[PDB]
Design a protein around this ligand. Sequence first.
Ligand SMILES: Nc1ncnc2c1ncn2[C@@H]1O[C@H](COP(=O)(O)OP(=O)(O)O)[C@@H](O)[C@H]1O
Ligand SMILES: Nc1ncnc2c1ncn2[C@@H]1O[C@H](COP(=O)(O)OP(=O)(O)O)[C@@H](O)[C@H]1O
Ligand SMILES: Nc1ncnc2c1ncn2[C@@H]1O[C@H](COP(=O)(O)OP(=O)(O)O)[C@@H](O)[C@H]1O
Lengths: 250, 740
Amino acid sequence: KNRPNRLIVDEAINEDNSVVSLSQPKMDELQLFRGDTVLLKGKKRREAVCIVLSDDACSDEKIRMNRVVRNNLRVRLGDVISIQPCPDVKYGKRIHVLPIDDTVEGITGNLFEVYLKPYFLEAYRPIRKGDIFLVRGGMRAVEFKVVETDPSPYCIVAPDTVIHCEGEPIKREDEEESLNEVGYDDIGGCRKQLAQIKEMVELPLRHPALFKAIGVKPPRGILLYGPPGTGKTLIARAVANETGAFFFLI
Amino acid sequence: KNRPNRLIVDEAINEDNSVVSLSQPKMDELQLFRGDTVLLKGKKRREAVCIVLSDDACSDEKIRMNRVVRNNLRVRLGDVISIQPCPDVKYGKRIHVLPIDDTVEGITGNLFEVYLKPYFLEAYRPIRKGDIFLVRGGMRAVEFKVVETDPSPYCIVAPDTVIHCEGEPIKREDEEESLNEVGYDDIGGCRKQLAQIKEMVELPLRHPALFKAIGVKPPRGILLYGPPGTGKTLIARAVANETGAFFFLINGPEIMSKLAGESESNLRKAFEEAEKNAPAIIFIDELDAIAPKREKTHGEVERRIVSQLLTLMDGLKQRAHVIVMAATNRPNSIDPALRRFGRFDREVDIGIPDATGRLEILQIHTKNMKLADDVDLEQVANETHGHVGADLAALCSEAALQAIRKKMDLIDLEDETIDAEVMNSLAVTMDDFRWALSQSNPSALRETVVEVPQVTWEDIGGLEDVKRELQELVQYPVEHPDKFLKFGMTPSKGVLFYGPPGCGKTLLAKAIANECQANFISIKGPELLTMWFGESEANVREIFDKARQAAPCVLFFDELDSIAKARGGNIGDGGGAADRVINQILTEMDGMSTKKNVFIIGATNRPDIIDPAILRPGRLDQLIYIPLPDEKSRVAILKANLRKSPVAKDVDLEFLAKMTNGFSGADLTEICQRACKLAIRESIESEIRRERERQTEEDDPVPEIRRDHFEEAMRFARRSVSDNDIRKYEMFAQTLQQSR
Ligand SMILES: Nc1ncnc2c1ncn2[C@@H]1O[C@H](COP(=O)(O)OP(=O)(O)O)[C@@H](O)[C@H]1O
Ligand SMILES: Nc1ncnc2c1ncn2[C@@H]1O[C@H](COP(=O)(O)OP(=O)(O)O)[C@@H](O)[C@H]1O
Ligand SMILES: Nc1ncnc2c1ncn2[C@@H]1O[C@H](COP(=O)(O)OP(=O)(O)O)[C@@H](O)[C@H]1O
């Protein structure tokens, strides 16, 4: 029960926060079609529900998912996850979502009709209790957590199910990070340069114990140079957030 | 019982930690055969058991043993040991070995089956109780001590005897050192430089009492210089560990990062502490950071630090048990008050290794890497021109990290962390080295290279009178100068090759530098033009100084007329003779040491425009005309250039020679290379045809350059030399002793 359900996370090409992209040999091997609600188990007893679509540029162990679902499953890029297909509910009953105080500051009016209204229109997306998703608009990005899921634990969009969610901003739990921070998706250009830095600091930062079982010196001095205003500090913040290492700034 | 059993330890050529190598006269004198278990008694009532094999390059008092057995016997290199043959057990019963806590850190799994299993297979090695040996693998070196030896005190390998050794890491006894430290074996390249340092610090450090029975001053200031990253501190650590002297380490930035009084106190404390624990070595690295040039001290505290170092170095002429070695980058980058007699009087240049040295360093760093068989370190060593030791260390580490990042980490999915046996099953490919060597390694060298070249007399085709003339001019004097003294003739210290462009001047000079087995410093034409254009002709002296730091040499001042040919040639800038750089060459050549075996060789393509003050006697004056090659030499040129390429039987080199006349060797090599280019193009067309198969073992691309290529590329043969060229060369010839 180990072989078909182990793949490694990598970067994404698609922008939807619910789609996960797998290569054609694995999806015919896994016996999976388009649209199917699937479930991902990761580190620390966490779950993620996702619609699946097909892509081309992957291997047979690579899964492409956006940053929102990647942070929802409590895993990071380059680690391994377990992927099982589930059966579909194809309705909802009464969902409930709350906003986050850390993202909502100085927003006036109601967030409901302007944001959550146009979002769940004609795009069947599954959701689970206790997740975090993000909506973009009005020159902002707003976070929403799902608290209560009436019919199943996971429920797809279903326009008969209106949203009753008129609640106060709920306190963001202090162990998990916001999704308005910086990551590999928030750096435009520099594919080659991110390739070099990602291959240079994969092993020492992700797998620390490995460098106690061998006498091999990994590179420790990296010097970034380029014209001013090209976002060099941004790359370091990104790499820090994506490997989960402590970041000090002098 | 003293005579047959006393020899002195020296360095090793073999890598096995159990073999000891002795010369043929001693082993027939000692009545010893191959394979015999022998016993060595050394200092402090210690023992060593060893298998013996035969070697060639030793005397009758030298024993070659590896570092492991040398440390097992509690002796060091250059000391004396006692050697007795014993009888053999030829079995074992139940041996027991333990690992060391100092070497084993973060090793997971069991060390037994992965290491001790493949080690004692088909190699009969004797062992004794209480020794220390070392095993290499899994990108580590692990130490093992033998605790219990059941049948004899010494027992040879015997595969019936399995090893029961499942024990905890045993605490390394605190008087003895680890064998993962640095020694003379852990330095690749630098044979000459280690020879100088080993002969310089043998007596003061090994035999201290000797310098209390004579008034003789041993050298106490040694200055190591060379490019950064060449491992200068490593040499000092090595020499320290091999002589057993106390090693103190001062460094530049650490002294300059403290407050004023506290930097003064640390500089004082270091010298007094190291003088307390005599015999010692004090090593100050990054000397040019702590004591730069005079005008480069903009502050005041800097001059006080330099003066403090000066007065401490002059307070050391009383003591004979302290030696001070420092490291810099170039000799003209520190305060000239330090490079004087009594303070820093010996200067050693480490410099860049060569192909043999690069092969040495690559063997040092891949010593426990478990390479595959297809990887050819000769390819790498030939393809790393411009790399120093730190770059090759980075190359090996990067190659290993590439060989652990693309597979066997993302195969660790069912598993969580690295397995020991999995880690051991890590081979590297030649393509992996091609990747690591191709990209991401900027070589850190723009420096002139000084080495023994690799072209020999078999490569130049023809010109045998010039061979027996150059052999005379270079080798005759330095071989045996007694005849020159009986007849009172000073040697000629120069030649001037003049002739047409591209007939093998550089080749000839590199060949005569090869046979003489001397270094070869080449100074191109662009370098002279650079020194004339930037108008800094001073650093020419540096070149000559470099020549005297690498003696013997063959300075080759190629394109010596390029300055003249760039200054309007015949007419321009008034129309004088001399220029800046050529004047500086005269001034440096005249005022140099008349016998050092430094041989200056010029070269030129226009022998008339060079200023006449260079061929006056006492300078380079023995003019040699390099002639245009002829038939019997053209055939030799052609076969020597084709000697690296496949060639068939139908190629008529006789007709090729007869057909091409007045062509310089450069053009014939162009013909050969362009014929090979057409051959390469034909082969790639054959590869695309046979790649585009009908469905898409008749693989042979015909790797044989047929006559068609030569007879077709012969249409692109161009005479680079006219007739009036040869005529004005003969006109310069008649201005010599031929017809005048
Ligand atoms: N490749 C890029 N992708 C996204 N944003 C970038 C990129 N390059 C530059 N920027 C933007 O330009 C700015 C770079 O300025 P910088 O001084 O590096 O930022 P910081 O304020 O973090 O020090 C940042 O605001 C960043 O948003
Ligand atoms: N000839 C050589 N043999 C072995 N290793 C060398 C050699 N030359 C350079 N190296 C390596 O290059 C590095 C030199 O850098 P250096 O600054 O001198 O070392 P350190 O860290 O001791 O100060 C060392 O890691 C050494 O292993
Ligand atoms: N006698 C020879 N034997 C072998 N190769 C030669 C010979 N003469 C010339 N060559 C070729 O000529 C080239 C060397 O030219 P060189 O004489 O250094 O030019 P220059 O005269 O401008 O210094 C080499 O590439 C070599 O292949």
